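Example 3.
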Amino acid sequence: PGTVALREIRRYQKSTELLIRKLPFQRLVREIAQDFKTDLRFQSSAVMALQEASEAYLVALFEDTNLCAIHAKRVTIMPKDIQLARRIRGERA
Amino acid sequence: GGVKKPHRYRPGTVALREIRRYQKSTELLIRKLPFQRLVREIAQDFKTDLRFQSSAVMALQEASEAYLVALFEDTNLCAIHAKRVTIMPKDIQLARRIRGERA
Amino acid sequence: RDNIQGITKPAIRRLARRGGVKRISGLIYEETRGVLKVFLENVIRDAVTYTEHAKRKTVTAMDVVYALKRQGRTLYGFGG
Amino acid sequence: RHRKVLRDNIQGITKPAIRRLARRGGVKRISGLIYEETRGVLKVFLENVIRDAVTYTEHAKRKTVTAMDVVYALKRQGRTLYGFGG
Amino acid sequence: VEKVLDRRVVKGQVEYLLKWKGFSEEHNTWEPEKNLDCPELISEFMKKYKKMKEGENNKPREKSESNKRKSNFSNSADDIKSKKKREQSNDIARGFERGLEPEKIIGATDSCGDLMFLMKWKDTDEADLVLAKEANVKCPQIVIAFYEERLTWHAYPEDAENKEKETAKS
Amino acid sequence: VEKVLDRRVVKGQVEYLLKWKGFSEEHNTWEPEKNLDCPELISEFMKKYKKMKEGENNKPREKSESNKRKSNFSNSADDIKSKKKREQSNDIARGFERGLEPEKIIGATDSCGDLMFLMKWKDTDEADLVLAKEANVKCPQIVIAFYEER
Amino acid sequence: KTRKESYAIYVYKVLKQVHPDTGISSKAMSIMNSFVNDVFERIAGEASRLAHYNKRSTITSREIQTAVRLLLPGELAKHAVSEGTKAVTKYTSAK
Amino acid sequence: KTRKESYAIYVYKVLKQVHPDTGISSKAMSIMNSFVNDVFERIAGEASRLAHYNKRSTITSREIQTAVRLLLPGELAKHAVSEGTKAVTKYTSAK
Amino acid sequence: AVSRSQRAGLQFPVGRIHRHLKSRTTSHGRVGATAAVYSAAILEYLTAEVLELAGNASKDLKVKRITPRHLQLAIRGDEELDSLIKATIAGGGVIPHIHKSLIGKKG
Amino acid sequence: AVSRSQRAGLQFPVGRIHRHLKSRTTSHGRVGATAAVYSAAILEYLTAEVLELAGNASKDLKVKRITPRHLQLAIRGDEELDSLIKATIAGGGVIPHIHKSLI
DNA sequence: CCTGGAGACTAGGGAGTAATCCCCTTGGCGGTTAAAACGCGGGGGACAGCGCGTACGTGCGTTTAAGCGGTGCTAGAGCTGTCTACGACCAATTGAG
DNA sequence: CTCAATTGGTCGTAGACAGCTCTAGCACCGCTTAAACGCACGTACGCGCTGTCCCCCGCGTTTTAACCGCCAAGGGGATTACTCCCTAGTCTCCAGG
């Protein structure tokens, strides 16, 4: 099948919805922030500013993996291509 | 495959030995006289007649070595995932899009 | 549940459809967290340093724009 | 006595040099269109340095590119060659 | 003020045994940096100190002893960071006088050499870190059996990608 | 002959492997140094053997644990035998095939496992590992001095 | 101050810092002199830029520890504090 | 209250003169305000770095024109110089 | 009352740029009135170009309110501003890509 | 002549570090005394980290001439050092990454 | 040879961390109807492998230029020390942000 | 409202670009000995066909915990004044790039 997933791409490419969580996403950052230095504090605009950058970083990372399948005649992404694509930018593994 | 034999070598020996031959000596594969003629063609576009010293060409020859090998390594690493062994001319535009260059 | 189970399975599928991914493998849901942790650690280690450099104890939104400028992922938000 | 009027310099490019430079990275075999596809990117990569060196030389009230403008032209592209000033 | 040889850090102050002109070795006293006039003697003294630290070719040692090796005269001065934590020095050095069995081996913070090996104890949750070499002589079996699965280290990321590409090429 | 893969130093003699074309690794034999005649296949291998060893530092990969390999083999001609593996170690002079006295202990790692007790012999460019139980019985003065280095 | 070749005497004096069985050539000194100069210029540019965002002007001893932690990763940031504290504790009349 | 001067109504003053029948919100203004502040710092740094090695201290008219040619390519910096020359020609002419 | 903004004919201030250029300039710079008019004009042109490029796509959807999505398409859509501005627009997404490998049975 | 080198024992000259920091005043600014001392220590440590590797890489040839190819083993051989130095090394030669799929 | 901090000095104008304006962040309880986890039919992906096209690998033939510098015309940096004109910092008009 | 922009004092010590010393620009056409590049005919592995392991689309059922409104303690934002002991300015010794 391919008719159901066809309109889902246009439904997401036309609206910039908030797909990132707010309450469960802050605990993941707090668990790592409490390990470096105790007695810390955060605000509400910092989480939104981080989510606005992560929403673009995810698409930027997925585009590089999706572009590596057209030349190889493939339609399904693979986790092995991400490690090879990250070595060109400078992040590596 | 020998040196005094009428038959030639098999495609898979000299190409593999050439990779190891350039890993023990430090030489400059980029030429100097034919490479200097291409810079003057672009430097004399819509500007006046300029000159150059004996250091700009030496700096460009060293700067191109860190770029050509870096661009070829990405293509060589990407050609393995395509179930192939030879690089393709259309893969350069796909490899340049991941780094940030336009294509 | 634990804090590491924040990112769900449909959350990654709803975000991968914006670029142009047709089919999503099963190992992506387990491999994306390993990269997201390293991506968030670079900002976490910088936020505490920026807070301690100003002799403060609260991470504001003005320091994130300055911290993301050196990482290469510049984003226009609260100043910067 | 200044500079020679050279024309049609795209035919004098060395062919075995491009094949020898690819053996250092680890490339096994090459195609036939690589020699025609590399020159189409080499000019674009060199124009980003050529157009900057002339501007850097004109900004310093000079007409000859010395051994200092090359470093400033390469630092903008993330190269920064070593062994030329600081 | 001639040729400096001795060098030690006393309470965060690097001393300099300045050799007096026309005196013996028993009359050399510690001269703190407070009133001097030798900008070249400080730079010329460290030019020969780094050569002695790199002269040990794979730690040479004969069979007739007389080959004592050491990193520094004050053990990395006073502001140490490896082995123990919370800087300072060896505040707690008790644990080998009882002789018990370790509970389990957990992880700690990674570093570039000399990791903080945390040793657990039974009943109470007392945390003790060893650093002295005298504890590995009376009971060397406990020090050997302690190192088992502290830091999980698989392999290099570059070597794992080569084997994974052979399962999908053909 | 393409490249050198197997190289072992047995009985004070360095022998190289003859990589024959059109075959594999099991069809390669051995030849003395005085019988070969290829000066171009010596410097290229010597410049690569040092580079492959200088980059294998900082907690390298693990190996086959819970294995003693040697430790009292047998009697009646313990040499010759067959073949161990296809790596650079394995079939190497570990002191039992030569009978030399140990010099000093080198190597200091910190990975998932026991300590690397790399015992280096006299007049030997290579080294191997020894047991932790028979080290404090023969010459225990070296094991104590090895820990008091840093 | 603002000259291009400000270092010349200290560059040629480096000869005993390596092994005594080797010597530095003429093509290996320019690569080593620029390496430290680039890091020094980067540190000087970061110190004059990280003070305006935090409302500062005087570059004291606390403004240098931030540039080392921001440039070097966390795996090697703790190895420089021991070397930096030795240069501060040795300087008297400053605690 | 001595806060930093931000460009908030500066863009609206020009937007109302060309398109008076357009209305902006409070969320799309900070995105456009930060872009100018981020693009001006690079030009300021490029103009300041071109005076330390050239033994200069006075910013003339060539330092501003060099940054536009260095950053923007030849496909877009051709009209910028022509648009900027008119402002200098009309300033030195009369009041 | 007369000022420097009405003499040269520019909506951007002259004093603000002159005061901001004195911070990045090393030592005591002499930033006069001939270094701010040429600097503010480029910024004004770059600010007006994005607005003019975004206003051409706001009249096709029949909406008078300025949306942040129109600013991202005016930057990522053009081949001149995409190579210069390497940053990402917060709350805008990317451009829709059309390919022939998004159906069933391969292509 | 006390200056600042007499109160702090370091290899690099302390008086040669504050010579370039006095130009970057940034309006009403001030240059500290301990800032140069703290900045010179990091530079000395970074220089020694490479000088030790350059001496440790050569132990079998005993050549009195340092080759530029041997100096690349300290930057390209360490992952923590290759990622910190974003500049390109002047000279050719890379790492012979021999893969199992090429042979 | 060269050409600038060093040291004595005591002006200029900032760090430390007290005071106190007027509304955020985080632990907590209650509960709508969002889109959470697990794992059902049967679409058509990935990987292993047989057969044999297109156009590369690998020496020889025949050049006519590649490399070092061979020699010597009259342009090209940087240094020097004249004259020249932009706009430091100052006080205080009268209007933008 | 507040405390930014402005005009036009006034002789401070920046900068434009002539001339001079004596580098190494790049013409003409010297020599040595291995590179440029034509197109033979060996046998690599292109990316089409279609074998057959146990992947994961579409959108059921109804847990777990998305994120909604609105409690009210006392965190520590981002400044504004006081008066500590920082290290500029700029004379003129005898060090150093």
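Chain B touches chain J through 17 residues (CB under 8 Å). The CA atoms of residues 79 and 87 of chain B lie 6 Å apart.
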